[PDB]
Design a protein around this ligand. Structure first.
Ligand SMILES: Nc1ncnc2c1ncn2[C@@H]1O[C@H](COP(=O)(O)OP(=O)(O)O)[C@@H](O)[C@H]1O
Ligand SMILES: Nc1ncnc2c1ncn2[C@@H]1O[C@H](COP(=O)(O)OP(=O)(O)O)[C@@H](O)[C@H]1O
Ligand code: SF4
Ligand SMILES: [Mg+2]
Ligand SMILES: [Mg+2]
Lengths: 289, 289
């Protein structure tokens, strides 16, 4: 039955739009799936619920005093395709750890047993910028077995992908957390599809799909909607279908192999986004060259 | 004498390039300044030192076993303008808190007394994506009195700016941490200079300067250099001069006034980057409109 999935990736590469869409495309193949957003900002469940920003567990637990005083119907809410939704809340700015927000919401969902009710999939939307103990909480507490890293042909998204992968490495031994695959979200930078496959092979995983840059996306967004919900017929919808399909069919759950900075930098130079280091000119003024 | 400064801001808006440059332009007016990078990645001191990536305290303390076994000359290193430099190191991926890395490096710098040696300024390069207790460590432990938030006319950078501001609010009472001003780093999106000044006034601070988009920057970067060091004569160098000047002359250290999501969203719509919400179409398919 059920699979415990989590999607990681750097901020602003389109982690939530890939997640919400493939989950809507998964639930177009009639799956009860649940999205749990771990991100400070409530942007991780909004497109399914046609909402602006779902209420978070840190918001509502402030209102009722504690988490047990929260009643599930107004915590977890369903939208398109009966896809269940919970935005967990960030840290109290400058003071709390992000981890806490995530853990209390897992516990509230195991406690009021929405985890064992019928669901074929659970998905955690998790930021991969800092891969600290806090954001690695679903990995540490063995709540996410299948990590799907969203990225693109750009240094920082790759860095992120690799550093998320070092965290899978540490909890390989303690549990069953394993990397599924990378998902390349096109930046329209030149031969990025190739680059991310190179990385995927150097880590020992696959670049499970290449999601394109489409305007479709922001057309659907003005309506606070998923692409799958706005126009079922655009090939963007069938991209997310190809991924949503490829996701359930995957049986490659490697225990990845992280690379050096230098090794990563190779990839970037080799595929043209990063330039090549001419050492002649280093440390030399407008004059000296 | 000495001022304890920290520059916060979202990832990839150019927090480290603004910081390293204005610090090089501050040290062009002959100041002994020290940069301490708190970021996981060692990209926060590299342009001063003509290096690729300075060694971090978490890296070297792994080598010698503990922090006391570290000798200061190969921890803190100086580059252009006798500007002292220390990259503190990130969390061990998936396990550590970022906070720890920062705190051990403050303590090592107070312990081996580089804090009380001659310096007119100290600067902490700190990521503003997650404003959790970890990244708020120099604010919590009253090591940074003057927060300078770098941002731009874009939602997330603003969000960030505001949330960093909520953290200043919480430690207003306990200490002397106060917000200096915002710095707008041009994205070349249309009337962003105006937008960030609106925010600065709604927070009760000023948009201390508007740093432009220049190609100069990446020309200097191929040499692993600051703009101030590559061509002292470009008006980009005199922008950083205008900021480096404006920074020491500032005596506006407000205890900011954070805004609503809705209130922030106003700004964006009012200044044209965000659109306006037509509710007619919300939750309605390719067909229904
Ligand atoms: N495939 C895509 N094509 C075009 N824009 C996209 C695509 N996926 C996401 N985006 C856009 O990128 C921006 C950020 O997306 P988001 O999913 O919110 O990122 P994140 O989760 O990494 O913070 C928004 O404009 C989003 O609609
Ligand atoms: N004023 C500027 N004009 C143009 N590009 C800039 C400017 N400041 C920074 N950048 C560029 O933005 C990118 C990220 O800068 P960086 O300082 O490394 O960001 P960060 O510290 O927020 O991660 C690099 O191309 C950097 O050179
Ligand atoms: S573990 Fe990470 S989320 Fe928690 S306080 Fe540290 S840096 Fe923040
Ligand atoms: Mg999000
Ligand atoms: Mg940096």
């Amino acid at each position: 039955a059920m699979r415990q999935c989590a999607i990681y990736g750097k901020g602003g590469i389109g982690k939530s739009t890939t997640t919400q869409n493939l989950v809507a495309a998964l639930a177009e193949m009639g799956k009860k799936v649940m999205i749990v957003g771990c991100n400070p900002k409530a942007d991780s469940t909004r497109l399914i619920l046609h909402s602006k920003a779902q209420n978070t567990i840190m918001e509502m637990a402030a209102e009722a005093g504690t988490v047990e005083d929260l009643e599930l119907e107004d915590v977890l809410k369903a939208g398109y395709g009966g896809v269940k939704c919970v935005e967990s809340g960030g840290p109290e700015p400058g003071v709390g750890c992000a981890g806490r927000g995530v853990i209390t919401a897992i516990n509230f969902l195991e406690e009021e047993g929405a985890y064992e009710d019928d669901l074929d999939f659970v998905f955690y939307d998790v930021l991969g910028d800092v891969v600290c103990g806090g954001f690695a909480m679903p990995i540490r507490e063995n709540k996410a077995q299948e990590i799907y890293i969203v990225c693109s042909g750009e240094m920082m998204a790759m860095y992120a992908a690799n550093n998320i992968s070092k965290g899978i490495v540490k909890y390989a031994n303690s549990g069953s957390v394993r990397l599924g695959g990378l998902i390349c979200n096109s930046r329209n930078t030149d031969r990025e599809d190739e680059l991310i496959i190179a990385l995927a092979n150097k880590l020992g995983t696959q670049m499970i799909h290449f999601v394109p840059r489409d305007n479709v996306v922001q057309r659907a967004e003005i309506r606070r909607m998923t692409v799958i919900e706005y126009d079922p017929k655009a090939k963007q919808a069938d991209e997310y279908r190809a991924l949503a399909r490829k996701v359930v069919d995957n049986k490659l759950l490697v225990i990845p192999n992280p690379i050096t900075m230098d090794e990563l930098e190779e990839l970037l130079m080799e595929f043209g986004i990063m330039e090549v280091e001419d050492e002649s000119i280093v440390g030399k003024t407008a004059e000296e060259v």
